[PDB]
Design a protein around this motif. Structure first.
Motif, PDB file in Angstrom:
ATOM      1  N   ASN A  95       0.842  -1.188   0.000  1.00 35.09           N
ATOM      2  CA  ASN A  95       0.000   0.000   0.000  1.00 35.09           C
ATOM      3  C   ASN A  95       0.882   1.245   0.000  1.00 35.09           C
ATOM      4  O   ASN A  95       0.702   2.156   0.806  1.00 35.09           O
ATOM      5  N   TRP A  96       1.837   1.262  -0.925  1.00 38.50           N
ATOM      6  CA  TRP A  96       2.782   2.362  -1.065  1.00 38.50           C
ATOM      7  C   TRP A  96       2.130   3.700  -1.380  1.00 38.50           C
ATOM      8  O   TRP A  96       1.229   3.783  -2.217  1.00 38.50           O
ATOM      9  N   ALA A  97       2.609   4.749  -0.723  1.00 38.41           N
ATOM     10  CA  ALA A  97       2.102   6.090  -0.982  1.00 38.41           C
ATOM     11  C   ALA A  97       2.606   6.454  -2.376  1.00 38.41           C
ATOM     12  O   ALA A  97       3.605   5.905  -2.847  1.00 38.41           O
ATOM     13  N   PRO A  98       1.919   7.375  -3.064  1.00 39.44           N
ATOM     14  CA  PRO A  98       2.366   7.757  -4.408  1.00 39.44           C
ATOM     15  C   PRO A  98       3.844   8.157  -4.419  1.00 39.44           C
ATOM     16  O   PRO A  98       4.283   8.953  -3.589  1.00 39.44           O
ATOM     17  N   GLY A  99       4.607   7.588  -5.351  1.00 36.34           N
ATOM     18  CA  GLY A  99       6.022   7.902  -5.457  1.00 36.34           C
ATOM     19  C   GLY A  99       6.946   6.994  -4.662  1.00 36.34           C
ATOM     20  O   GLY A  99       8.170   7.085  -4.787  1.00 36.34           O
ATOM     21  N   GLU A 100       6.364   6.120  -3.848  1.00 40.07           N
ATOM     22  CA  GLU A 100       7.135   5.194  -3.017  1.00 40.07           C
ATOM     23  C   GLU A 100       7.051   3.770  -3.564  1.00 40.07           C
ATOM     24  O   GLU A 100       6.099   3.427  -4.267  1.00 40.07           O
ATOM     25  N   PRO A 101       8.055   2.925  -3.258  1.00 38.23           N
ATOM     26  CA  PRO A 101       9.240   3.231  -2.445  1.00 38.23           C
ATOM     27  C   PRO A 101      10.310   3.877  -3.327  1.00 38.23           C
ATOM     28  O   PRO A 101      10.572   3.400  -4.428  1.00 38.23           O
ATOM     29  N   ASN A 102      10.936   4.945  -2.841  1.00 32.79           N
ATOM     30  CA  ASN A 102      11.936   5.648  -3.644  1.00 32.79           C
ATOM     31  C   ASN A 102      13.398   5.519  -3.231  1.00 32.79           C
ATOM     32  O   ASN A 102      14.281   6.068  -3.903  1.00 32.79           O
ATOM     33  N   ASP A 103      13.657   4.796  -2.148  1.00 33.19           N
ATOM     34  CA  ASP A 103      15.015   4.613  -1.637  1.00 33.19           C
ATOM     35  C   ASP A 103      15.718   5.966  -1.567  1.00 33.19           C
ATOM     36  O   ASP A 103      16.837   6.139  -2.057  1.00 33.19           O
ATOM     37  N   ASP A 104      15.057   6.929  -0.938  1.00 31.25           N
ATOM     38  CA  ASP A 104      15.618   8.266  -0.837  1.00 31.25           C
ATOM     39  C   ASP A 104      17.005   8.270  -0.210  1.00 31.25           C
ATOM     40  O   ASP A 104      17.273   7.549   0.751  1.00 31.25           O
ATOM     41  N   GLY A 105      17.890   9.082  -0.775  1.00 28.50           N
ATOM     42  CA  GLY A 105      19.247   9.164  -0.269  1.00 28.50           C
ATOM     43  C   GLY A 105      20.031   7.896  -0.539  1.00 28.50           C
ATOM     44  O   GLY A 105      21.204   7.791  -0.176  1.00 28.50           O
ATOM     45  N   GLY A 106      19.387   6.931  -1.188  1.00 30.23           N
ATOM     46  CA  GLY A 106      20.039   5.670  -1.487  1.00 30.23           C
ATOM     47  C   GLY A 106      20.209   4.810  -0.247  1.00 30.23           C
ATOM     48  O   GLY A 106      21.080   3.939  -0.202  1.00 30.23           O
ATOM     49  N   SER A 107      19.374   5.044   0.760  1.00 30.72           N
ATOM     50  CA  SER A 107      19.467   4.279   1.997  1.00 30.72           C
ATOM     51  C   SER A 107      18.167   4.157   2.790  1.00 30.72           C
ATOM     52  O   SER A 107      18.122   4.511   3.967  1.00 30.72           O
ATOM     53  N   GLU A 108      17.111   3.672   2.147  1.00 28.11           N
ATOM     54  CA  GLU A 108      15.835   3.469   2.837  1.00 28.11           C
ATOM     55  C   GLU A 108      15.441   2.021   2.597  1.00 28.11           C
ATOM     56  O   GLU A 108      14.858   1.680   1.560  1.00 28.11           O
ATOM     57  N   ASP A 109      15.764   1.167   3.563  1.00 25.67           N
ATOM     58  CA  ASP A 109      15.473  -0.252   3.422  1.00 25.67           C
ATOM     59  C   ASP A 109      14.403  -0.795   4.370  1.00 25.67           C
ATOM     60  O   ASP A 109      14.135  -1.997   4.393  1.00 25.67           O
ATOM     61  N   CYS A 110      13.792   0.092   5.147  1.00 19.76           N
ATOM     62  CA  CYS A 110      12.723  -0.302   6.061  1.00 19.76           C
ATOM     63  C   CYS A 110      11.425   0.346   5.595  1.00 19.76           C
ATOM     64  O   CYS A 110      11.440   1.180   4.690  1.00 19.76           O
ATOM     65  N   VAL A 111      10.301  -0.048   6.188  1.00 20.66           N
ATOM     66  CA  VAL A 111       9.001   0.482   5.784  1.00 20.66           C
ATOM     67  C   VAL A 111       8.190   1.016   6.960  1.00 20.66           C
ATOM     68  O   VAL A 111       8.122   0.386   8.016  1.00 20.66           O
ATOM     69  N   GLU A 112       7.575   2.181   6.769  1.00 18.26           N
ATOM     70  CA  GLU A 112       6.743   2.782   7.807  1.00 18.26           C
ATOM     71  C   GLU A 112       5.327   2.934   7.263  1.00 18.26           C
ATOM     72  O   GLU A 112       5.128   3.083   6.052  1.00 18.26           O
ATOM     73  N   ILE A 113       4.346   2.866   8.156  1.00 16.39           N
ATOM     74  CA  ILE A 113       2.955   3.044   7.769  1.00 16.39           C
ATOM     75  C   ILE A 113       2.460   4.316   8.455  1.00 16.39           C
ATOM     76  O   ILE A 113       2.626   4.483   9.665  1.00 16.39           O
ATOM     77  N   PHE A 114       1.886   5.222   7.665  1.00 14.28           N
ATOM     78  CA  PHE A 114       1.384   6.498   8.167  1.00 14.28           C
ATOM     79  C   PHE A 114      -0.014   6.392   8.764  1.00 14.28           C
ATOM     80  O   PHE A 114      -0.659   5.352   8.684  1.00 14.28           O
ATOM     81  N   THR A 115      -0.485   7.492   9.345  1.00 13.90           N
ATOM     82  CA  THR A 115      -1.814   7.518   9.934  1.00 13.90           C
ATOM     83  C   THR A 115      -2.895   7.349   8.864  1.00 13.90           C
ATOM     84  O   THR A 115      -4.034   7.013   9.180  1.00 13.90           O
TER      85      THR A 115
END
Ligand SMILES: OC[C@H]1O[C@H](O)[C@@H](O)[C@@H](O)[C@@H]1O
Ligand SMILES: OC[C@H]1O[C@H](O)[C@@H](O)[C@@H](O)[C@@H]1O
Ligand SMILES: OC[C@H]1O[C@H](O)[C@@H](O)[C@@H](O)[C@@H]1O
Ligand SMILES: [Ca+2]
Ligand SMILES: [Ca+2]
Ligand SMILES: [Ca+2]
Ligand SMILES: [Ca+2]
Ligand SMILES: [Ca+2]
Ligand SMILES: [Ca+2]
Ligand SMILES: [Ca+2]
Ligand SMILES: [Ca+2]
Ligand SMILES: [Ca+2]
Ligand SMILES: [Ca+2]
Lengths: 152, 151, 152
Positions: A113-133
């Motif tokens: 259930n990725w938010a629009p534009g995700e997952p983008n590996d921002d900064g080349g270092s995003e390997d975990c996943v968070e769920i928003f409100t």
């Protein structure tokens, strides 16, 4: 026969009273930090921690980090996130193969259930996943602190 | 005979469950719950306005605290004292001013109003709060009070 | 007979369901404030209180203040102290006879894990016991506020 029958009727009365007491206590237990969906139970610790520490807490408790595998499970998890007003970590990561998120077992996602534009590996270092409100997902650095929610 | 064996086996498994469950009930209630009769009161530990509080309890499969006897009121009072925060009860006179009812519409079977209450102060108090002394006072539903549900 | 056979099978199914449901519920309950060791369960209230207050809370709850009786129990209790990063009170005191620590019943200690030099009745007024994040014990003034942990 006659003794056995009544012995069965008696034991079942005990069991059904136990089923009633247990059902009541289960509802009590889930309030206000848990959510049941299907045969799964999500429960938040009420505080935030970095991924590794959060993961260890869930595993030591006999469960694992929240792993929503359907829209229904995601919705249930979303309720706790909204209640605590704190985004939470999911169990999935793409540490082994960048771009490929998997559950702790190594299995590939069966729901997302990725938010629009995700997952983008921002900064080349995003390997975990968070769920928003709002229930949507975003890949985020594992070193960040997020709400700890385990599933049992 | 085979059934006889199965029954004796079940009795042992049931005894184990009963003993283990008995222990976990005590563990569960500590420190935010209170058992009185067949009812269980449990606090969320935080405050919310009436509508929000009511929704939390209903979605959890219960309802806001609704003491129906002095015994239940005293048990509820223990949680209020422990958290040192007045709590909302489930009853309101939102439908008909002056007539407090449970979420079902039933009239009260018990009450512990402080002297002079309910007074509909400012002409706008349709909810009920319980103080640390166990007494009740009608208060504006918009105020934030301890959330305590009953199951 | 034939009927009794069908009912026994139904009862068996009910008990098996409960064993599975209860096991899941236990894990949920213990997360994140409880620790099970042997037949004993330690559970923290998550807040601090002076000895008398803490003691009363546990007793009214049908239990008593944490009373580790072995290295195994002490290690389990230690996990909660570390998790909350708050030293906790134990049930034992030497209020009756200075220099002699006992359980609430009056029985002498069957196990101890005092830090070096303790108990030292510092200031001539330390009759209660606290357990540190390292698991060691220290006698401390009963009026101090420490993490409340009960055993059931
Ligand atoms: O702070 C990291 C975060 O920044 C923005 O919100 C977006 O680029 C996200 O994709 C990213 O995860
Ligand atoms: O208690 C007297 C009076 O004090 C305030 O005005 C409010 O709490 C009222 O609800 C209450 O009736
Ligand atoms: O140095 C040890 C000594 O430190 C302080 O005085 C207190 O915590 C005492 O309880 C303890 O014995
Ligand atoms: Ca619980
Ligand atoms: Ca990577
Ligand atoms: Ca990545
Ligand atoms: Ca991202
Ligand atoms: Ca009105
Ligand atoms: Ca009114
Ligand atoms: Ca009033
Ligand atoms: Ca002394
Ligand atoms: Ca002393
Ligand atoms: Ca000392």
């Amino acid at each position: 026969v006659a003794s056995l029958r009544q012995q069965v009727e008696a034991l079942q009365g005990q069991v059904q009273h136990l089923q009633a007491a247990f059902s009541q206590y289960k509802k009590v237990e889930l309030f206000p930090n848990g959510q049941s969906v299907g045969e799964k139970i999500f429960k938040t610790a009420g505080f935030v921690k970095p991924f590794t520490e959060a993961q260890l807490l869930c595993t030591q408790a006999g469960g694992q980090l929240a792993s929503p595998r359907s829209a229904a499970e995601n919705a249930a998890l979303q309720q706790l996130v909204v209640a605590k007003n704190e985004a939470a970590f999911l169990s999935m990561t793409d540490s082994k193969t960048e771009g490929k998120f998997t559950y702790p077992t190594g299995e590939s996602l069966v729901y997302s259930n990725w938010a629009p534009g995700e997952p983008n590996d921002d900064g080349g270092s995003e390997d975990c996943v968070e769920i928003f409100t709002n229930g949507k997902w975003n890949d985020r650095a594992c070193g960040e602190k997020r709400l700890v929610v385990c599933e049992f």
